[PDB]
Amino acid sequence: SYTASRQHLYVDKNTKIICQGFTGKQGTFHSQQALEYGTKLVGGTTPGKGGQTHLGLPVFNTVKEAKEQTGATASVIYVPPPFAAAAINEAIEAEIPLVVCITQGIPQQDMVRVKHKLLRQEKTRLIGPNCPGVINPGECKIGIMPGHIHKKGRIGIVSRSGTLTYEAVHQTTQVGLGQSLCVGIGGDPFNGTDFIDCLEIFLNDSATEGIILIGEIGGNAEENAAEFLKQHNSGPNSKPVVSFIAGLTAPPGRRMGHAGAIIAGGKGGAKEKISALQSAGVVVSMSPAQLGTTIYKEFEKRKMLEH
Amino acid sequence: MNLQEYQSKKLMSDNGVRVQRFFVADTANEALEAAKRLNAKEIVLKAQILAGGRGKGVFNSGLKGGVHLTKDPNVVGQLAKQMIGYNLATKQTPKEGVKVNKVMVAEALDISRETYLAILMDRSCNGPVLVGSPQGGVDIEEVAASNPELIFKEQIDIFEGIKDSQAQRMAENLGFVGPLKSQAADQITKLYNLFLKIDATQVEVNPFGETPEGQVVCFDAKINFDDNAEFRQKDIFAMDDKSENEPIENEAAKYDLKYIGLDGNIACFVNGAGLAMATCDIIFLNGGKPANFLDLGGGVKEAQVYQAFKLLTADPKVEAILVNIFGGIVNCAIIANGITKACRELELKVPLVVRLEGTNVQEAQKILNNSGLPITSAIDLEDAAKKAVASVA
Numbered sequence: 236s237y238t239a240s241r242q243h244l245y246v247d248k249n250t251k252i253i254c255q256g257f258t259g260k261q262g263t264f265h266s267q268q269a270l271e272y273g274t275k276l277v278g279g280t281t282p283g284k285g286g287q288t289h290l291g292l293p294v295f296n297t298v299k300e301a302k303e304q305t306g307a308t309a310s311v312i313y314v315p316p317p318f319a320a321a322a323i324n325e326a327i328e329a330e331i332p333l334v335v336c337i338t339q340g341i342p343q344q345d346m347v348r349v350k351h352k353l354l355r356q357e358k359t360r361l362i363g364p365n366c367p368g369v370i371n372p373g374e375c376k377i378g379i380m381p382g383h384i385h386k387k388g389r390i391g392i393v394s395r396s397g398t399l400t401y402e403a404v405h406q407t408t409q410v411g412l413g414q415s416l417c418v419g420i421g422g423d424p425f426n427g428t429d430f431i432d433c434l435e436i437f438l439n440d441s442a443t444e445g446i447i448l449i450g451e452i453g454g455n456a457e458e459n460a461a462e463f464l465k466q467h468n469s470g471p472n473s474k475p476v477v478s479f480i481a482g483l484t485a486p487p488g489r490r491m492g493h494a495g496a497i498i499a500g501g502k503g504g505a506k507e508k509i510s511a512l513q514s515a516g517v518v519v520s521m522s523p524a525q526l527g528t529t530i531y532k533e534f535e536k537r538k539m540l541e542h
Numbered sequence: 543m544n545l546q547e548y549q550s551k552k553l554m555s556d557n558g559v560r561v562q563r564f565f566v567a568d569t570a571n572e573a574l575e576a577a578k579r580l581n582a583k584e585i586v587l588k589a590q591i592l593a594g595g596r597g598k599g600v601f602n603s604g605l606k607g608g609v610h611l612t613k614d615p616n617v618v619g620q621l622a623k624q625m626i627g628y629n630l631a632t633k634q635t636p637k638e639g640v641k642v643n644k645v646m647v648a649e650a651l652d653i654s655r656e657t658y659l660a661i662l663m664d665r666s667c668n669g670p671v672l673v674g675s676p677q678g679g680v681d682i683e684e685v686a687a688s689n690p691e692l693i694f695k696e697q698i699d700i701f702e703g704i705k706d707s708q709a710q711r712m713a714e715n716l717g718f719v720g721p722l723k724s725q726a727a728d729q730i731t732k733l734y735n736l737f738l739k740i741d742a743t744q745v746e747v748n749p750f751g752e753t754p755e756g757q758v759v760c761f762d763a764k765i766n767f768d769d770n771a772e773f774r775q776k777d778i779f780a781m782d783d784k785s786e787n788e789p790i791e792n793e794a795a796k797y798d799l800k801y802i803g804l805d806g807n808i809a810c811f812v813n814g815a816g817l818a819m820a821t822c823d824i825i826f827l828n829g830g831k832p833a834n835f836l837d838l839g840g841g842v843k844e845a846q847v848y849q850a851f852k853l854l855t856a857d858p859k860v861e862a863i864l865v866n867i868f869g870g871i872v873n874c875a876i877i878a879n880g881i882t883k884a885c886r887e888l889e890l891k892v893p894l895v896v897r898l899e900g901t902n903v904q905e906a907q908k909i910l911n912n913s914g915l916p917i918t919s920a921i922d923l924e925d926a927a928k929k930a931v932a933s934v935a
């Protein structure tokens with residue numbers, strides 16, 4: 236089952252990465268950032284430029300070649316919307332263990348076709364599309380997140396919102412807790428990784444001592460996560476979970492940027508998600524600026540800070 | 543994206559979906575001739591506006607109602623003269639109403655049975671789902687709350703396509719019997735293939751009905767389109783009717799900007815849909831009212847930033863501007879350059895609170911520090927919200 240690929244989310248210092256769309260504007264800039272961060276970016280693909288050299292690294296026409304020649308176990312996609320679904324499929328077919336798709340704007344119907352293939356295999360784990368990526372601070376950065384705000388630590392972060400991911404990271408760096416692993420699952424309605432996927436990794440990871448879950452209006456993934464936490468994160472040794480759900484004041488019936496962010500037919504509202512998470516013991520920060528302080532205090536109440 | 547009734551019904555008809563035979567008219571005389579050319583026992587005349595409630599609307603010509611039935615083509619023309627060129631206002635338009643430039647003239651058909659039939663991309667089901675109920679003519683949300691056992695669904699495999707067995711089963715669950723069942727199943731199939739062809743997120747028919755004469759007809763329908771597929775749906779998006787949209791939102795769209803106007807007085811200039819929603823939330827939390835939602839997307843060009851900022855400075859209600867950028871793919875320096883360029887021409891008679899963090903934040907702060915502009919700096923999101931609310935209180 237595709238759930239067997241969940242472990243591939245936990246990138247580390249040994250993860251070698253290729254960049255699909257390597258020579259494009261954003262693929263170039265964020266590849267530069269990844270190299271400066273110390274990430275083992277070893278090459279990239281751009282159909283028609285195989286054999287060339289870019290940022291001092293080899294360029295390949297296909298993922299299959301790039302994987303065989305470089306030993307990469309992860310790929311990140313900076314391919315424009317008309318072709319990005321095909322780029323994801325190429326990475327799945329090449330059995331890349333982890334694929335991160337940054338691209339915003341892939342047709343929903345395209346992603347339905349990608350998900351169809353994705354769910355019928357388990358060599359490849361997809362994060363995204365329309366997401367910032369995944370980062371293991373100080374070990375492996377795959378995506379667009381600003382490197383300098385991270386600090387290796389104890390909080391696992393999963394968020395549908397890229398920018399709110401950065402807020403959670405910054406706040407948990409500020410209060411000294413740091414981050415174990417940070418996954419932006421993106422704002423699209425059809426994607427490769429949901430809250431439960433990341434929550435499984437977090438609850439089983441000893442380095443993750445607390446969790447921040449950031450959601451928003453639309454869908455029912457937060458409600459599913461609430462039930463998952465009810466059954467797997469109750470009792471004595473539970474890990475504190477803090478959450479913020481964006482859109483409490485959003486107008487109904489409007490797509491709020493993310494196509495996945497809409498209140499339609501009375502479903503997808505923020506208050507229902509907040510209540511579901513609260514019923515599971517999650518502490519919901521009403522302010523998005525207080526995620527760090529809220530989880531710090533939950534660590535304090537449980538005497539989890541060794542001052 | 544929005545399509546007039548006559549545009550969507552044409553799209554459905556051109557793809558095999560049975561709708562009421564109809565013509566569209568720009569003049570009362572065209573309405574009269576269309577009525578006579580129909581050669582129909584009874585006729586329906588329908589004002590073409592996007593908002594709902596056309597039936598209970600009122601024109602500034604005195605005519606009550608945007609939908610009229612009659613057997614006489616002469617009445618169709620008499621009524622159309624009071625519609626074309628006039629403003630139709632309903633319970634869902636501004637008080638000034640919407641100018642009606644076109645009317646539909648369609649064959650009126652008796653409805654012996656109403657059902658609900660829709661096709662949508664279902665997030666929970668990871669693909670297209672047929673949704674149907676024999677209880678037609680009412681909001682499906684009500685049927686779901688009153689009689690969930692009457693909501694029937696079929697999950698369609700995106701590669702296999704809809705199977706006859708699925709179309710037949712849904713047709714039966716909707717109460718279609720005998721030859722009407724084969725008719726309904728064929729229409730369900732054509733609706734599904736249309737849904738895929740046009741990159742719809744939803745095609746909703748209500749009522750999906752029978753006539754006394756034994757025809758299955760899509761009497762009314764709403765199509766929601768996937769904006770991400772515009773690049774491969776140029777012909778359909780060309781038909782987009784922006785005449786009833788909020789005007790600032792229309793301007794933003796010209797530059798690929800996602801702007802949603804609100805009722806407050808604190809403008810918001812943010813990157814990311816989540817941070818943008820969260821900024822509205824935190825302003826409310828701290829005693830303010832946001833004037834808009836605004837999501838500056840991924841790779842911003844200075845020109846887009848410049849135009850986006852001007853969209854905030856030209857809303858009469860705006861009494862303060864909150865800039866909150868946490869840049870990853872968004873380059874903070876591009877934001878700074880666009881804002882300062884806009885402020886050089888504006889005048890800026892309102893407080894400007896600026897929170898910048900992330901990609902290239904140092905260069906960005908330098909630009910703002912060299913600008914000579916009256917900027918209130920904020921260190922974090924709560925600080926920015928408190929300073930914004932205080933600046934207009």
Ligand SMILES: CCNC(=O)CCNC(=O)[C@H](O)C(C)(C)COP(=O)(O)OP(=O)(O)OC[C@H]1O[C@@H](n2cnc3c(N)ncnc32)[C@H](O)[C@@H]1OP(=O)(O)O
Pocket residue numbers: 255256257258259260261262280281282312313314315316318321322337338339340365366367397839840841871
């Ligand atoms: C956090 C949410 N995400 C976002 O905000 C991301 C928003 N931005 C986007 O979605 C943008 O479309 C992307 C960042 C994906 C791309 O934008 P960008 O400005 O970098 O596009 P470019 O046109 O410069 O570069 C795309 C490259 O992909 C290449 N490419 C096209 N198809 C493929 C493919 N199948 N495999 C690999 N590379 C490909 C193109 O050749 C181009 O490279 P080139 O200029 O060397 O020929």
Ligand SMILES: O=C(O)CCC(=O)OP(=O)(O)O
Pocket residue numbers: 365367379395396397398399421422492813814815816817839840868869870871872873
């Ligand atoms: O990296 C940036 O600058 C934007 C991040 C983003 O798009 O986030 P969100 O829209 O998913 O909330």
Ligand SMILES: [Mg+2]
Pocket residue numbers: 397492813814815839840
């Ligand atoms: Mg975004």
